[PDB]
Amino acid sequence: GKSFSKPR
Amino acid sequence: PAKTMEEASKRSYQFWDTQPVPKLGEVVNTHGPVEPDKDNIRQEPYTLPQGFTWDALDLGDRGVLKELYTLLNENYVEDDDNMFRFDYSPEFLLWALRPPGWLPQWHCGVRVVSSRKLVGFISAIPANIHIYDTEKKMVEINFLCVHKKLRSKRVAPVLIREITRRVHLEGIFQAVYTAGVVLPKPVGTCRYWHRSLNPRKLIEVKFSHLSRNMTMQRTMKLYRLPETPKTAGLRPMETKDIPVVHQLLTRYLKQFHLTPVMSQEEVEHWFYPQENIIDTFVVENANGEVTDFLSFYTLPSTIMNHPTHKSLKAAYSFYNVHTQTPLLDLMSDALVLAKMKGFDVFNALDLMENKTFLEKLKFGIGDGNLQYYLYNWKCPSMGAEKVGLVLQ
Ligand SMILES: CC(C)(COP(=O)(O)OP(=O)(O)OC[C@H]1O[C@@H](n2cnc3c(N)ncnc32)[C@H](O)[C@@H]1OP(=O)(O)O)[C@@H](O)C(=O)NCCC(=O)NCCS
Ligand SMILES: *C(=O)CCCCCCCCCCCCC
């Protein structure tokens, strides 16, 4: 992305 | 930077207020450019702070490509907790940055005059974009990066204005881009979801946590996958599949409101398999006809400051087209294939029809939004399920 996500 | 939209409307945007984008607060009921095309373009590069110079990067030079790899490996996007950082490979960067139509002046680097150290970058690639009822030639902006030591010094606005200028010179006046931050003004807001493939590793590195009421043994059994895919006739895409994959993609995308319009050459570039970069599998049925395909690209991340686990291997859902195989079955085989190829996690956004399978296939919702933006184009926002564009 332009965003490193992780499980909430 | 703001993460929530409500938190962003308390913010003032000293740079974005000067740009032809809608204001965060206004509602858009029109379809068209924010401002007319310019018929004279500034010929001179914008001025950088003293001691820094522009340098267009020849990514065909192995040494220069490696400098960009290192800039991004050390300074590009991190998660919120500063535990993980994208680790785009050199060969992946070539894939992302030299698609058909790529231009050398659009690989826009900034160097320290004395040391020549690469400290900044921004890129454009050309792309034909369908937005509601309009097809426009645009650019896709990506890989905006300022060295950590140069941050908060007004350098990113100069990179943006300079790439804008260099794109204007080529006759293009619209762009599409994505950000994890809220800016004026999202055309669409998507959400990353994650499907564990190696739950143990993910927990040890604190990418994920154990669910409140279940054990590690349970978590491992929960995420176990078959050893091999189930869809009849699934195989890797070959050169002979380029036309039908283009056909399938083009027809499938018509149902969304923000999509690329790819030539057959662009389809070859973006989907033809390259190990450790892009995987595409087609379904060739009992009659020899290709009726579906799945695809995902390879993007590992550095695990920062960890003594044993240094990298996290992630697969990213790309474009998945179904016409005879159920999408749910297609994506289950994607997961199995990613597991087989050694990935630790499988990521996918909630755009296109992905919400129809995310929960059923045991994805967990992420903490990061991916906002989609258009530059110099006014149109109504759309729900995630109407976004049909995936960027690297
Ligand atoms: C993004 C990055 C280039 C910004 O550089 P910076 O030194 O922190 O920001 P600057 O001081 O140069 O100027 C900030 C201006 O550019 C805007 N801006 C910040 N990040 C932006 C981004 N990814 N895209 C577009 N504009 C951005 C800011 O909103 C601000 O404009 P504003 O006054 O209207 O709010 C830098 O932080 C970076 O390299 N981050 C890691 C890679 C990355 O792109 N992360 C962004 C994910 S959303
Ligand atoms: C993430 O790296 C994307 C960063 C987007 C920065 C803003 C770009 C705005 C559009 C500039 C090009 C306009 C060409 C007409």
Numbering used by the authors:
A (entry chain D): 2 to 9
B (entry chain A): 105 to 496
Q: Can you provide the manuscript's text about this entry?
A:
We therefore investigated whether peptides featuring Lys3 could be NMT substrates through either or both Gly and Lys moieties. We next challenged whether blocking the alpha amino group of a Gly-Lys starting peptide with an N-acetylation, by analogy with the crystal structure featuring Cα3 rotation, could render the ε-amino group of Lys3 reactive for MYR. When the N-terminus next to the Lys residue is blocked by an acylation event compatible with the size of the aa3 pocket, then Lys-MYR takes place.
NMTs are thought to transfer a C:14:0 acyl-CoA (MyrCoA) exclusively to the N-terminal glycine (Gly) of specific substrates.
